[PDB]
Design a protein around this nucleic acid. Sequence first.
DNA 1: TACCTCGTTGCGTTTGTTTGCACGAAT
DNA 2: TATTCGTGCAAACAAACGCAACGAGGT
Lengths: 82, 82, 79, 73
Amino acid sequence: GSHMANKRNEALRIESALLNKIAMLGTEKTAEAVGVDKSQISRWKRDWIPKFSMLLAVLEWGVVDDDMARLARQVAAILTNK
Amino acid sequence: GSHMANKRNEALRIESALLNKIAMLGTEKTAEAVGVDKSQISRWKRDWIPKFSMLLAVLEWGVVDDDMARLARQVAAILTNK
Amino acid sequence: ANKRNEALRIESALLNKIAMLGTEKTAEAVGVDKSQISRWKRDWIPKFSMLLAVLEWGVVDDDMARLARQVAAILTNKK
Amino acid sequence: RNEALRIESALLNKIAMLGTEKTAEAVGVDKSQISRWKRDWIPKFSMLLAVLEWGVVDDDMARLARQVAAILT
DNA sequence: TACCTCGTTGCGTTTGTTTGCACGAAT
DNA sequence: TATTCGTGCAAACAAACGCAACGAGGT
C-alpha cells in the first residue's frame, strides 16, 4: 500500500535533497560558488531552505485546467488592443 | 552538461522559470509559501529569487517551465478568434 | 461595481511598487524624506487607493504583465 | 514631456468629473476639507505615481498587443 | 602553547524602513 | 492664540552580511 504525495511531505523531501546537495558539495564550496560567505550558506539552511522548499513543493502541483484557462483569458486581455 | 558552464547563466534561466511559475501560482499562494507580506512580494522576489536561483544552479537542481508553452498556446487561441 | 476589491488591488500595487523601488529610494525620487514615504503608506495610500478605484485608475498587475511579455516573446519567436 | 504634470491633469479632471461629494467619500475626508486636501495631496501623489511609473506598463502592453497582432494576422 | 578542518555561531558593519520629536505653514 | 498637519532629521529598528573565533569529527 501507499499514500499519495502531498505538499508538506514533498517540502520535507525537497528540503532533505537540497540540504544533502549542499553538504555533498560542502558549505564553504557552495558559498564560494554562490558568492556569499559560508556563514550565509550555513544560516540559509535554517532561515530560507524551509521556505524555498515549501515553495518548490507547491510548484510541483502545476496549474490545473480551470486556473490555466483563467490565466490565458487574463493574459489574452492584456494582449488585446483597444 | 559536463563542461565549464558559468553557473550564473543557468541561474538566470532558473530565475526566469521560477518567476514565471510564481506568476501563474499567484501572489497569495506564493507569499503564503514563503511567509512574506503580500504587499511586499515584488520586493521579496527582487531580493531573493536571484540568490535562490544561483543556489539551485550551483546544486544542479533542475527547473523546467513547461506550463508556459501551455499558456502561450491557449492565449494564441483566444487572440486568433477575433 | 465592486470598488472595494479594486481599491485593495490598487493599494497592494502601490505598496508593492514602493517596496520594489525601495522606501528610501522612492523618497529620493519624489523629493521628500524617507519618513514621509513610510507615513504615506500608512495614512493616505489606502484611502487614495479607493479614490483611484472609483476613478477607474487601476493598472495592469505586474505579474500578469510579466506573463504577457513572456507569452508575446513565445508567439513572436517560437516556431 | 513632464509625466507628473500629465498625470496630475488627467487625475484632477477625472476627480472633477466625480464631484465633491463622491471624492470626499472615497478618501474619507469631510466635504468641507476636500478642496484643501486635493490642493495639497494630488500634487504629491501625482509625483509619486510618475515615480512608480503608473500607466507605463499598460502603455507597454498596448505596444506588445499591436506587435503580436501583426504576427498573428 | 587544546591534532587540523571546515561548518556553526558571536558580533560589528552595511543597507534599508519606521518612530520620536519639534518646527513652521495654514487656518 | 492655539490646534491640526505634514515635514525633515536623527535615532531606533530591522534585514543580511562578512570576518574570524570556536570546537568536534575527520585529516
